[PDB]
Amino acid sequence: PSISEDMAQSHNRELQAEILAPFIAATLHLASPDMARYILLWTDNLRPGGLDIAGFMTLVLKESLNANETTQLVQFCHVMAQLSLSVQTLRLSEAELSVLVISGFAVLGAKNQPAGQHNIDTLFSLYRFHQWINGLGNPGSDTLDMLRQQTLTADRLASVMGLDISMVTQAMVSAGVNQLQCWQDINTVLQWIDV
Amino acid sequence: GKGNVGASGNELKLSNRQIEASVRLSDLKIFSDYPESLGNTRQLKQVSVTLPALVGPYEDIRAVLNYGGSIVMPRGCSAIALSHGVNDSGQFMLDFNDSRYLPFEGISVNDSGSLTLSFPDATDRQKALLESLSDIILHIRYTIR
Amino acid sequence: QFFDLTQSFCLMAQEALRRELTDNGVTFIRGGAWNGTTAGLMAGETLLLNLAEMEKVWLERDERALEVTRTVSLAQFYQALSSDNFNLTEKLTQFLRE
Amino acid sequence: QFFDLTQSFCLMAQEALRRELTDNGVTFIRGGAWNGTTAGLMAGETLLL
């Protein structure tokens, strides 16, 4: 009843996700419409059952015109349920998720898989990044700022941590990283300095 | 069955079965009517029209006023009609307090656009009626700021 | 009861709009405002959105239609009929005689 | 949805005023009422201003 096909045949994915965000926020027991829109972007980037968001909404507006793919629609639904409860359990907050989704998880990195799959590695890496976000403290948010671009530099990093610069120099020479392009690099420096 | 006299904007023609008479609004020289003192922006807001020809009972004159300017204000006021012409303004009432806009409101006082008096089927049913036609009066009320 | 009554009024409003615009396709009352799972609450503001949509449609598609008046004479009309052209007054007086 | 609709109404009102004063430069609505960070709240009183 609420929405129709008029903006369903459009090409503006972000507009469609933004306008659908309240409905998913309700059906998914989710906090804010912005997180609904972000997780919509994420599920689109997954493409669970060979679907996009516009297709998702067109099929929903269809009155169960798919005999078998309605189960695929509800599989998409359970998939966003899983990602949403991942967010709830890991307690990720607004800005970190926004950066990760707007960067297509490029600021994370993964193994033999772009962005992020739905396996254990993604969950573990996101959890690590989140404890590190929390332990950054007050300036850590603007740290994410310099993380959104590739201006994340060594001396600023060490100064935020409160640690020595030369430690970080040795860590980048040992870990082989010349620039902290992705959180894989950051995490490797983290593990080397932790050792 | 066809005539043409006049220049662009100020013309009279008989197209198809329809007599057209276009008047260039800028051609009327409303600027010179009153001094530039105590007035900066002038614009048209009302037009009534009179057709005092030989008309008895039961004869129904049909006229159309159309404006074809560049300033395009939404429909409802871009054209008016004439049936009686006895100080006919094109409405059941002459109210200046209308919540809505009067037809032909906001026009530039000497816009490059033109206004057309059009008589349908004068070939034809209004041929006799417009044969007896003498002339037309245009009472234009306009405001000056 | 109050919701049923305002629902009937809003339906009547939609029909009035439909007649005014002489288009019988535009619909805004799509039902479901009495959401049963939630005691049928919070339908007033959904109806308010319906009314806002009504007002938007009415104003945006508004068109001050051009007005024309036509005078018709029954004597001339009947005297000038394509299939049965006849004197109207004479037939009147005759039908009066019988 | 309601805020989008009232945004439309406010913009057509602005256009009506621009016609009335016959000046096309005066602007009052400059967007930003739908503050996305705040779930698009706080637009109503903005339109009031």
UniProtKB/TrEMBL annotation, chain B:
Residues 76-143 form the Tc toxin complex TcA C-terminal TcB-binding domain. This is XptA2 protein. It comes from Xenorhabdus nematophila (Achromobacter nematophilus). The chain holds residues 2393 to 2537 of 2538 of the full protein.
UniProtKB/TrEMBL annotation, chain C:
It comes from the Bacteria. Signal peptide: none annotated. This is XptA2 protein. It comes from Xenorhabdus nematophila. The chain holds residues 2295 to 2392 of 2538 of the full protein.
